[PDB]
Amino acid sequence: WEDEFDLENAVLFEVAWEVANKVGGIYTVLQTKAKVTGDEWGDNYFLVGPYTEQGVRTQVELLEAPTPALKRTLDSMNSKGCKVYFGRWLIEGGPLVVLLDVGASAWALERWKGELWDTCNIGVPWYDREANDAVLFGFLTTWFLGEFLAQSEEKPHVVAHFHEWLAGVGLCLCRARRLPVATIFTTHATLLGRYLCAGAVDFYNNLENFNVDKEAGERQIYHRYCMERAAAHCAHVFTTVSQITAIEAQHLLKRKPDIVTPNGLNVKKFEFQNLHAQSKARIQEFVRGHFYGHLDFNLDKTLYFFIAGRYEFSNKGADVFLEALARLNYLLRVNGSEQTVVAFFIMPARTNNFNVETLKGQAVRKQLWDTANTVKEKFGRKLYESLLVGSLPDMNKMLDKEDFTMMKRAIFATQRQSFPPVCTHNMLDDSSDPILTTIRRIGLFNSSADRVKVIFHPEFLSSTSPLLPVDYEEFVRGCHLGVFPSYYEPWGYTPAECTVMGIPSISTNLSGFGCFMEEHIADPSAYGIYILDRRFRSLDDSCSQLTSFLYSFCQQSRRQRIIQRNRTERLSDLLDWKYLGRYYMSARHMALSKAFPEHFTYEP
């Protein structure tokens, strides 16, 4: 937005446990949003966070505060028993960060807990180190905000935006001290949602039939749920990153969010067909190496699907992907479609080292490539010489005995009897792995009859990997489709990266990204986004619909695939922070309107 709003003396503090502390996905959200928030708030934008030695040592450049009230606040809090650091976060925008050492202020924790009893009726056990750190951080942030307001010679308007339950106890304390502060609360994931969905008792179907206190008591996380609910209740403005998480919060936190604030990206033109061509060529080389001695299928009609992210079988919907892969294999075999589908499972697991068959295949492909280049180069040299002389070359003589010997060595190298391995690594738990168990149960063994090959790479893609020395970026640029049929995904960062990169993707309406694209696009499938109806369908129906999506993608021609990919490359403008920051702007404006109705007015 380009709204005309008053922020002349207003100051914004964005409180988050992940500021200069990468312990989740909110770190990238804050890092990317810092630029667009700075371009609007100037030097009145601060990022409260926790003090970590590693984070400061690698990311924070300690500075001297720029306003006298800020020096007075830091000095008072440092001489009153705490240790507070002021610095600049070394990212785009270089936002000023107010880091707090929670451990150095632990000596008051007991007394502070008493305060939490006297205002909020919230108690925390001693053994919850994470919750006690949250309490310390919240008390430190509240004290910082109060001291900053006290030391200001002219009292400004403070907007405190707390992220997640870790930072929300500060919101509870701020609302319990009548501080002139506009408090916003953003939940990037409801706390009980992960545990309830992990129970596999139809989390989304029974959202209105849950006993939140009973479930928390079963999980022994009642204090955490209570403090997040208090943060959501007390906030002037309650926002969420998605509509599905908004429903989760309406039914679990018992408050309907005021705005939904989707996560965005710093899209930077990371065209899209040169990179796709190069990455597809490298993926083809990897597939040639892996399937050496079994390359009986056309590689010009091979489609590369992929799924990535954290290795959560049920949550990421990898079981649905595998079942749909088996059904699609049957569909391709029965219909005689000469299409081949190579499905990559890039999901890190606990692995020992690289498989012997996979390394041997890569070495065999390298040897074949070297042999082919050598023979081709000397053939071209002899051909050029013959053409210069003016004679039509005789191919029965342009190969000397050395070429035949080395080609025979290559042919003997390619000889192989076993089938290509499903997994490229040695899994420490072959029996305990859900992906391998499902693959061996459904019958996808990379045989010649199978039209669907499966490659499970249980490690992060890096350029230092001997197998496939390309990062996640460049690897998935060369894939045709990304399938993310997730069940519990509050926003979904892998599908969003995939869409920004220009690759058509399959998401669900139970993910935040899927809901976002569903509500922002008239016909998502035209643009390359396929949304599964996982919220109103049984899992068998979800697998059938995913199979239909995959078969429809396979039945597309090259022309339709290119057109769809062009539309997907168009789509990336929706996912930038330039468009998606207006939701945060609106949330801050409602917070200012609610906390200071006399000075600020908001028109929704």
């Binding site: 009893w117 008591g217 009642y222």
Partner: protein, 32 residues
Amino acid sequence: PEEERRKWEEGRIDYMGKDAFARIQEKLDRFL
């Protein structure tokens, strides 16, 4: 009357008992 705060420690909390969230909301709303 700090007996309930003793129960709040160590996770010995009766979720639907005396320390239910209704009283938490009441005390929050009173000082809001």
